[PDB]
C-alpha cells in the first residue's frame, strides 16, 4: 500500500511499511516558517534516535526492560490485535519515562564501550 | 545539573552531561535567517562527525595518535584539573590539524574495510 495505508492494520503488519512513512516526512513567510519547522522537527527526531544509539535503524532494539506498569498486555494482543494508533494512545502517559530510560542506557553503554577499547 | 551546568566542572565530570548540551542545540526575515543558520551549523557538525566515522556517537575513539606537541600534559592533569573551556583555549591553534588527520584516517579505514569485504 501507499502512505499511511497500514494505519488501520495490526502493529505487526504495519511494521513492514516503515520506509513508506519515513520517505514522506521530507517529500511567503508563512510557507518558509512551515518548512523550517518541518526540518527542525525531523532533525529533533533524528537527534533523539542518535542519543538512544539508533541513528541508522528503522527498527532498533535496546537494553531497557519493559516495566509492565506501562502495559500488561502480552505480545499476541499487542502485535496481532492492536493498531499503532491504539498503542500510541494506550501508553501516551509513559512516553517520556521510556525516553528517559533509553537515554540513560546509551550513556552507560558508551562509557562501557570506551572502557573496553582501553584494554590493551 | 541543567544546560551548561558542567561548564565549570572538570573534563571528566563534564563528559557525563553530553546529552544535555546536545539536546539544546535544536531546542521575520532576521529570525528565519537565524534559524536557517542554526540548522546549517548543526548539519555541518553532524557531517563532520560522519566524515570521521563518528556519526552515531557522543564519545568516539579513533586511530589518530596524540602528537604530544599539541599538549604535553598527562591524563591526570587534563581530565581531573582542567575544564573544557581551558582545554578548548589551550589547543585552539591545532584544531584544524587534528581534524585533517581524523579525516585521513577514516578514508584509509573505508578502503581497508571494502578490501576485506572483497575477500571470498
Amino acid at each position, epitope marked *: 500500500d501507499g502512505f499511511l495505508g497500514a494505519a488501520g492494520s495490526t502493529m505487526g503488519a504495519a511494521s513492514m511499511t516503515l520506509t513508506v512513512q519515513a520517505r514522506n516526512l521530507l517529500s511567503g513567510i508563512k510557507q518558509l516558517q512551515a518548512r523550517v519547522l518541518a526540518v527542525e522537527h525531523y532533525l529533533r527526531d533524528q537527534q533523539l534516535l542518535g542519543i538512544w544509539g539508533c541513528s541508522g535503524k528503522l527498527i532498533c532494539c535496546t537494553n531497557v526492560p519493559w516495566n509492565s506498569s506501562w502495559s500488561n498486555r502480552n505480545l499476541s494482543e499487542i502485535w496481532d490485535n492492536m493498531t499503532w494508533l491504539q498503542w500510541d494512545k494506550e501508553i501516551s502517559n509513559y512516553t517520556q519515562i521510556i525516553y528517559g530510560l533509553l537515554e540513560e542506557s546509551q550513556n552507560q553503554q558508551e*562509557k562501557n564501550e570506551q*572502557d573496553l577499547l582501553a584494554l*590493551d | 545539573d541543567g544546560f551548561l551546568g558542567a561548564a565549570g566542572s572538570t573534563m*571528566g565530570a563534564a563528559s557525563m552531561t553530553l546529552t544535555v548540551q546536545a539536546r539544546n542545540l535544536l531546542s521575520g526575515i532576521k529570525q528565519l535567517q537565524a534559524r536557517v543558520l542554526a540548522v546549517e551549523h548543526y548539519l555541518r557538525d553532524q557531517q563532520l562527525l560522519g566524515i570521521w566515522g563518528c556519526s552515531g556517537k557522543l564519545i568516539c575513539c579513533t586511530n589518530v595518535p596524540w602528537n604530544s606537541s599539541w599538549s604535553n600534559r598527562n591524563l591526570s592533569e587534563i581530565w581531573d584539573n582542567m575544564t573544557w573551556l581551558q582545554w578548548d583555549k589551550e589547543i585552539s591553534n591545532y584544531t584544524q590539524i587534528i581534524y585533517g588527520l581524523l579525516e585521513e584516517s577514516q578514508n584509509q579505514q573505508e578502503k581497508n574495510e571494502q578490501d576485506l569485504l572483497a575477500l571470498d
Partner: antibody
Amino acid sequence: EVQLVETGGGLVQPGGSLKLSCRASGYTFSSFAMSWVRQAPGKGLEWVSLINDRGGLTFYVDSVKGRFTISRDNSKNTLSLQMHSLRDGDTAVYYCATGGMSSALQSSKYYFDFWGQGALVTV
Amino acid sequence: ALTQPPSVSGSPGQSVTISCTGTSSDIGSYNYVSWYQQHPGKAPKLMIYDVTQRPSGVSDRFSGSKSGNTASLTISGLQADDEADYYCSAYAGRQTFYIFGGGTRL
C-alpha cells in the same frame, strides 16, 4: 593508608554456594577497579576475577566463567563474590585487591596496587 | 603460568636476580610485568609495576628489567628481612588478563 578486609565462610561441600565480601577504606572506592586473586594452600597465586570501577564490566578466568559472579556497591564500599559449585580444585585463600584495570581517562594500571588479608575457602 | 626458578639465594649484602620467562603473547608484547613480595602467611606486597617502575615506600634495592620474553627482578644488598616468595605477573591481553609465575623462595 588503605585497609581491605575480606569476610567469608568456612567449610562448604561440593555443589554448594559460598559468598565472600571485601570491605575497603582509606581511598575513594569508586575510583578504582578491583579484582579477586586466589592462592591454593600449597601453591602460588592466580587471578580469578576483575570488576571495573563502575561495576558494569566483569571479567573471569575460563575456569570460573560459569560458577563465579563478581559485583560491587560503591555506596557501601563493598566488593562481593558469589561462587557456585565449588569443586575441590577451588580450595584457596581468596584475596581482594585494588587495581588491575583503568577506565580510559586514568593512567594505566595492569598491576594489583593494594591487597587485603584473605578469606580461606575450604571445599 | 610463567616460569621462574624454584629458588634464588646469596649472602647478605650481595645482589641476586630472580628471572621470569614467558612467551611472545605476554611478557614480549606488553610492557606490564609487575613483581610482588609475599612473606609467608601474609598477603603479597607490590614491589615492581609496569617494567621498571617502583611503588612509593619501596627502597632502591629492588629494580628490574625486560629483554625479549624474559623479565627479571634484581635485589641488591640482600638483607635478613628479604626472605619471601617472589612472584611475577604479566598482562596477557583481553582473553587472558593476568598470568602469574611459580613462586621463587629467596
